[PDB]
Structures are given as structure tokens and as C-alpha cells.
Amino acid sequence: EKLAAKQVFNKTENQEIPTMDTSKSTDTLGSQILGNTMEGLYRLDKENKPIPAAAESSTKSEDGKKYTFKLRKDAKWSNGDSVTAKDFVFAWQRLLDPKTAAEYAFIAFPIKNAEAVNKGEKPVTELGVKAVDDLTLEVELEQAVPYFLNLVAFPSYYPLNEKFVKEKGDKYGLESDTTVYNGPFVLTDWKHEQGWKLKKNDQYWDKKTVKLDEINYSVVKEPATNVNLYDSGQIDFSLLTGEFVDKYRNNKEEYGVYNEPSTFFIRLNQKRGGQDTPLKSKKLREAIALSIDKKNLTNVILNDGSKPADYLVPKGLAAGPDGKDFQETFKNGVKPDAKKAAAAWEEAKKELGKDQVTIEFLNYDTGNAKKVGEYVKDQIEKNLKGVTVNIKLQPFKQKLKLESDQDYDISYGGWSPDYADPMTYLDMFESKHSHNQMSFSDQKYDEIIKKAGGELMTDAKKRWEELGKAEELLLEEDVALVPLYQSARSYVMKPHVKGVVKHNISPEYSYKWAYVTE
Ligand SMILES: [Zn+2]
């Protein structure tokens, strides 16, 4: 295993990075690039376990509500500034400051006074996080969270250089030269919708461990172009979907499958801007959930190890107090049936006072997402005779803004867990939660969801049954959204590229331990 001369890793992504502002990032792509150009207090190691990163150690109080983090004196930002505990004070106050309008403010609510800060009841200075020293960060929690060292390894908890963010203002995080880096790599040559480079950060304290000199990224939206780039040696890595999986499936040196605790689904928006949509109809939402044969979607279109899913909480995310997987236990979801779909759609005509309906289907502009869109559109139109579904392709940045603004009717999207617990899928759909984005509201659901939260440390077992009935109320009774599949990424990786880590929680990839052999 001899090191090569060129420590260069070439890949593609099929979207432009939405933003490099840590406080406003909502998505797995920004998380990937931030998770390689920043460093939180902790990071996930090669087997997804939280280890000291920007902190060199941490202590946990008797009652589990106070944390003390000890930082590295030699840690520096890419502009030469020392990484201080005040960078953690600033970043966390900025994520929660109402004026920031951060859609991920909620992931910091475990911090003391965080939700009061985000509501605007107390000033940001009351946030349960203090810089006693340049190298000592103490953090007070509302209550004990056993996976808190995991949460500080999540990108929304990454630090920020206040002086740099204040100087760049509203340009902060939109450009590679308007972002500053405390991670293993720096972001350079960020050509919007084209590509960007990760270069080894010479100002990083653990630069001795980083072997890659650069990771090159191109935006490529067509799987056929990705297979050509890989075969010609232009790139070292490619996801595989559809017919393109068949060619590589048998190659034990290069082919892998990433089995992701992650699900894709159709969002049903009940209120577009401030006007009701046909999706207010419980019978229409039921009819859309019954009309999609998911077996043909995953076995022919995806073709990559993805499993059909009637459930939202993915299999292998978390296990209960008896060690049984959450999704194997409850097996929640509506089972598709074309005939039940028709009969529920007949009922839906009376609820709405219409026999013909036009719903806009919001979709990614990538090659395999088009085929998924056309399949679902053909399934709904075929089984709900009189429904017109108009597909709208959008790039990811623009698609995420339409969703957060609720300027859509139905949307195809996916959720990657923020933590190894079903609440990361379920909490989204409580009334007025940041990521509902479909004006779905059920008082029955909100009560059960928030009961499960204080209960984890007290009555963990009752909580497990509570969340199972809550997903049941959400999928089968209310039919708030339509799950499609549990994701599994097919890929090829060149044999000479070693040590690349796939994670269950974002950042999805770490490259700091990756190296190239000959
Ligand atoms: Zn290579």
C-alpha cells in the first residue's frame, strides 16, 4: 500500500451548493462541503462514532445538563485567526437569533434558553453557552440529551469567525472567498452551477493527518455523463441509478452499496402561498398514496438497492429499549392498491366539488429524478382518472426555496436523519414546525410528538409505542405525505482511492483520512 504522487480525488455532484452559510444550510450537499471545510467540537470517526475534533476533550456534569469543552490552542481559521470558544458562542447565537430566520434553529433547542431566544423572549446573550476562556466552552442544556456529543458533530453546530462574517455581511457564505474555513480543506474556485475545489488547508492543526491535496467537483446532472467520466478516469467516484447499475454490479474491486437510514417521499402541500390546494382533501391525499406501485419504482427506475417504503422512519435508524428496529416493530404506512385509489378518488371528487384536478409536481432537474417524476406522474394519472399532474424541474437551491415558501402542490424530496432517533423524521410535521412546509396540522399528532421528548430519559418504552402510533396517525389516518422508498446508493470507487468515509448523519462524507495508492 504505497502512497501515490497525485493526492487528488475527482468526483461530481448533480446540484450547485445551495449555501456555505452554516446558519442557513438545510441540505446534505452544503453539509458535505461544510463537513470537509469546517470542524465542530466533535466529528464522526470512520465508524460513525463522535470523537473530539475542534475540542481535544469534554466533561459531562452529574445531571448531564452542563458540558465543558476544551479547545486546541493551535487551531486556526484559513485567514490565520485562532479558533476560540467565542466562535461557538457567536455561531449558536446567530443560528437562534430571530433576525437570522434560520430554518435549522430548532436543532439547537436542547441548549438552555435556545427556544426562548428563537421566539425572542430573551436576548441572544442568555444562550446557555459561555466562552470562559479562549479554549474553554461551557454549554448548559434544558435537559440531558444522551446523543449531545453527536449533535455538536452536526453541521448546524459548526463554529463561525464573527469578524469575518460581520465584514462580509449578506455576502457571507455565498462565495468561496466570502467564506472562511477551520476544516481539513478550504473551498476555492466555486463557479456557481459549474464546480468547485476542496484544497488541503495548510492552517489546519491536524493537516499532518490530511493526505489529499485537493478534491475536484463538477456539477453533472446526467448519469450517462457520470459513467463516461468514471470509465475514462476523469472522476474517481460515481453514484449509479437505472440501467447504469447493471454494468458495474459484478465488480468487487469498485462497486459498493451505501445502505442509508434515509427515505424519499412526496410532500402534499395543503396551502400554496395562502390559498388551499386540492391536497386539503384527506381522500385525495389517500388516493395519491394508493395509486403508486413502489415495487417497479425501486426495481426498474432506481435499480440501486433502494427498498419500496410505505413507512417514513427508515429501517436501521434506531432500535428500542428491547433492541428491535423501529420500522420492523410498527411496519407503518398505506399499502398501494390501484382499485382502493380509484374508489378513494371518487370520494375525493365530492369533497372538492370538482371531477378534474391539476396539481403541479415539483421535481429535481437531474437525469434519474426526471424518470422517477414521469413514473409517479403516470401512476397518479392512470389510477386517479381526471387528475392532471404537471411536472416542474428545478435546481436544488431554487427547489428548496419553493418548498420553504410553500409555492408547490406536491413535491418529491428526501430526508437524511440529523440524529439516530425517529424524532428527526416525526417532529417536522407538528403544527408550524420549521420543516412542515405543507400546512399539515393535527392536534392529536402534536400532543403525542411533544410528550415523546421529555419522556426519553424517563419513560423510554412508552415513548417507543407513542412514536409508532404517531407515525401511524401521520401516514395511514391523516395521510400527510406519501413515502416512496428507503434510499440505498449504488456507486463505483476507483481501487486506488482509499479511506473515504460514508456517514449515516451529515456530513455524509469525510475525506480527511482518504488517500490515493498506486
Ligand atoms: Zn484516481
Nearest to 308 by CA among 255, 256, 375: 375
> 90-123 burial, b for 16+ CB within 10 Å, e for fewer?
bbbbbbbbeebebbbbbbbbbbbbbbbbbeeeee
* Structure-derived torsion over alpha carbons of residues 64, 67, 68, 72, reported in degrees to the nearest 10: 130
435 among annotated binding-site residues:
no
322: burial class by Cβ within 10 Å (0-12, 13-18, 19+)?
Answer: exposed
CA 237 / ligand 1 centre spacing (Å): 9
Do 155 and 102 meet the contact criterion of CB atoms below 8 Å apart?
no
Three cell numbers, residue 95: 443560528
The answer on 357 and 476 residing in a single domain is yes
Do 412 and 266 meet the contact criterion of CB atoms below 8 Å apart?
yes
Q: CA–CA distance from 69 to each of 40, 82, 398 (Å)? A: 11, 16, 38
β-pair type (387-394, 357-364): parallel
> 277-295 burial, b for 16+ CB within 10 Å, e for fewer?
bbbebbbbbbbbbbbbebe
CA 7 / ligand 1 centre spacing (Å): 9
The answer on 318 and 275 residing in a single domain is yes
236 among annotated binding-site residues:
yes
Do 410 and 277 meet the contact criterion of CB atoms below 8 Å apart?
no
CA 197 / ligand 1 centre spacing (Å): 15
Do 141 and 65 meet the contact criterion of CB atoms below 8 Å apart?
yes
CA 224 / ligand 1 centre spacing (Å): 19
The answer on 378 and 281 residing in a single domain is yes
Rounded CA-CA distance 475/442 in Å is: 12
Q: How many domains does the chain have?
A: 3
The upper half-sphere exposure of residue 378, i.e. CA atoms within 13 Å in the direction of its Cβ, equals 10
Q: What is the CATH number of the domain that holds 120?
A: 3.90.76.10
Nearest to 131 by CA among 43, 183, 70: 70
Q: Is the alpha carbon torsion for 98, 103, 108, 112 positive or negative?
A: positive
The answer on 352 and 400 residing in a single domain is yes
The answer on 515 and 482 residing in a single domain is no
Rounded CA-CA distance 316/330 in Å is: 13
Number of CB atoms found within 10 A of residue 270's CB: 19
The answer on 289 and 189 residing in a single domain is no
Torsions phi, psi for 62 (to 5 deg): -60, -50
Among 101, 136, 161, residue at a domain's last position: 161
Rounded CA-CA distance 304/320 in Å is: 29
Q: Residue 64 sits in which domain range?
A: 39-161
CA 193 / ligand 1 centre spacing (Å): 23
CA 494 / ligand 1 centre spacing (Å): 6
The answer on 68 and 105 residing in a single domain is yes
Rounded CA-CA distance 22/165 in Å is: 11
Q: Which residues pair with 139 in a beta bridge?
A: 67, 129
DSSP letters along 13-40, please?
ESS--S---TTT--SHHHHHHHHHH---
CA 189 / ligand 1 centre spacing (Å): 20
Resolution (A): 2.4
The answer on 324 and 245 residing in a single domain is no
The answer on 144 and 224 residing in a single domain is no
CA 168 / ligand 1 centre spacing (Å): 36
Q: Which residues pair with 11 in a beta bridge?
A: 217
Helical spans, DSSP H, in 63-113: 86-96
433: burial class by Cβ within 10 Å (0-12, 13-18, 19+)?
Answer: middle
Three cell numbers, residue 282: 384527506
Rounded CA-CA distance 9/108 in Å is: 34
Rounded CA-CA distance 141/64 in Å is: 8
Among 146, 161, 176, residue at a domain's last position: 161
Helical spans, DSSP H, in 38-112: 86-96
Nearest to 257 by CA among 303, 196, 305, 190: 305
CA 4 / ligand 1 centre spacing (Å): 10
CA 309 to chain centre: 18
Three cell numbers, residue 299: 426495481
Q: Which amino acid is at 302?
A: L
Do 277 and 359 meet the contact criterion of CB atoms below 8 Å apart?
yes
Three cell numbers, residue 354: 370538482
Rounded CA-CA distance 477/469 in Å is: 10
Angle at 499 between CA 504 and CA 198, to 5 degrees: 85
Angle at 181 between CA 176 and CA 187, to 5 degrees: 35
The answer on 268 and 219 residing in a single domain is no
Do 321 and 461 meet the contact criterion of CB atoms below 8 Å apart?
yes
For residue 256, the 8-state DSSP code is E
Rounded CA-CA distance 138/131 in Å is: 7
The answer on 427 and 306 residing in a single domain is yes
Place of cell 454549554: 139
Do 149 and 42 meet the contact criterion of CB atoms below 8 Å apart?
yes
Three cell numbers, residue 149: 456529543
CA 40 / ligand 1 centre spacing (Å): 29
Rounded CA-CA distance 201/185 in Å is: 5
The answer on 483 and 436 residing in a single domain is yes
CA 413 / ligand 1 centre spacing (Å): 32
DSSP letters along 488-510, please?
EEEEEE-TTEE--EE-SSSS-EE
Rounded CA-CA distance 359/392 in Å is: 11
Q: Which residues pair with 185 in a beta bridge?
A: 200
CA 306 / ligand 1 centre spacing (Å): 27
Place of cell 410532500: 267
CA 493 / ligand 1 centre spacing (Å): 9
Do 197 and 189 meet the contact criterion of CB atoms below 8 Å apart?
yes
CA 343 / ligand 1 centre spacing (Å): 55
Rounded CA-CA distance 62/267 in Å is: 43
Q: Which amino acid is at 279?
A: L
CA 155 to chain centre: 10
CA 442 / ligand 1 centre spacing (Å): 52
Nearest to 377 by CA among 358, 390, 364, 386: 390
The upper half-sphere exposure of residue 114, i.e. CA atoms within 13 Å in the direction of its Cβ, equals 24
Among 161, 181, 197, residue at a domain's last position: 161
Number of CB atoms found within 10 A of residue 379's CB: 21
Q: What is the CATH number of the domain that holds 14?
A: 3.40.190.10
Task: For residue 123, say if its preceding peptide bond is cis, omega within 30 degrees of 0.
Answer: no
CA 29 / ligand 1 centre spacing (Å): 22
Q: What is the CATH number of the domain that holds 369?
A: 3.10.105.10
Q: Which residues pair with 8 in a beta bridge?
A: 214
CA 458 / ligand 1 centre spacing (Å): 51
Rounded CA-CA distance 493/509 in Å is: 13
Q: Which amino acid is at 34?
A: L
Rounded CA-CA distance 45/368 in Å is: 31
CA 234 / ligand 1 centre spacing (Å): 8
The answer for residues whose C-beta is within 8 angstroms of residue 141's C-beta and 6 or more apart is 64, 65, 66, 67, 110, 111, 112, 128, 148
CA 11 / ligand 1 centre spacing (Å): 10
Place of cell 421528548: 453
CA 500 / ligand 1 centre spacing (Å): 13
